[PDB]
Ligand binder design. Structure first.
Ligand SMILES: CC1=C(/C=C/C(C)=C/C=C/C(C)=C/CO)C(C)(C)CCC1
Length: 175
């Protein structure tokens, strides 16, 4: 009875890039297939004078040889015909870290407390998603009141992703 087709999902109305700038702490995530950032994750968003949005990000990750390193990453965003939907190109400061190109959607935000992000890397023949990831971000690395926790859960049900996330530690391991 629920529609899980990716083309039917509602996104943030009248999205505002300049208002989204500044520091964002990751507090929970849903993982995709393969290598991915593990914990101690912080993001910094910026917008230039001509309207182009970009970001940096740091976090610990375990490489192919299980070595434990602090990764320093960089991303740039290209606008589309929906103001909340972007294309993101990304890479690292060290040459052995991963590079690529992903969809980046803002499902909802209030700019001053919380944000919900989503990416579908592959579509099924019937229009639902075959490989996805998602981040829950905070301005304040504290818990979220009861009423904001309830709005975050309603957005996780829209995405057909209820009960598939885990909490992330913050440890000092990276700078
Ligand atoms: C750049 C960037 C993002 C994605 C980063 C990812 C996808 C990194 C993967 C790193 C790996 C796998 C390193 C191992 O070689 C997010 C969405 C947080 C928003 C801020 C900018």
């Amino acid at each position: 009875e629920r529609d899980c087709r990716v083309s039917s999902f509602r996104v943030k109305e009248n999205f505002d890039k300049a208002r989204f700038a500044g520091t964002w702490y990751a507090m929970a995530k849903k993982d995709p297939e393969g290598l991915f950032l593990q914990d101690n994750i912080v993001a910094e968003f910026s917008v230039d004078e001509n309207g182009h949005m970009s970001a940096t990000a740091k976090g610990r990750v375990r490489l192919l040889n299980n070595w434990d390193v602090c990764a320093d990453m960089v991303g740039t965003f290209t606008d589309t015909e929906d103001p909340a939907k972007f294309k993101m190109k990304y890479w690292g400061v060290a040459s052995f870290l991963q590079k690529g190109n992903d969809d980046h959607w803002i499902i909802d935000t209030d700019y001053e407390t919380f944000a919900v992000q989503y990416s579908c890397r592959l579509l099924n023949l019937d229009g639902t998603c075959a490989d996805s990831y998602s981040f829950v971000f905070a301005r304040d690395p504290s818990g979220f009141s009861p009423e904001v926790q309830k709005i975050v859960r309603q957005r996780q049900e829209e995405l057909c992703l209820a009960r598939q996330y885990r909490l992330i530690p913050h440890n000092g391991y990276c700078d």
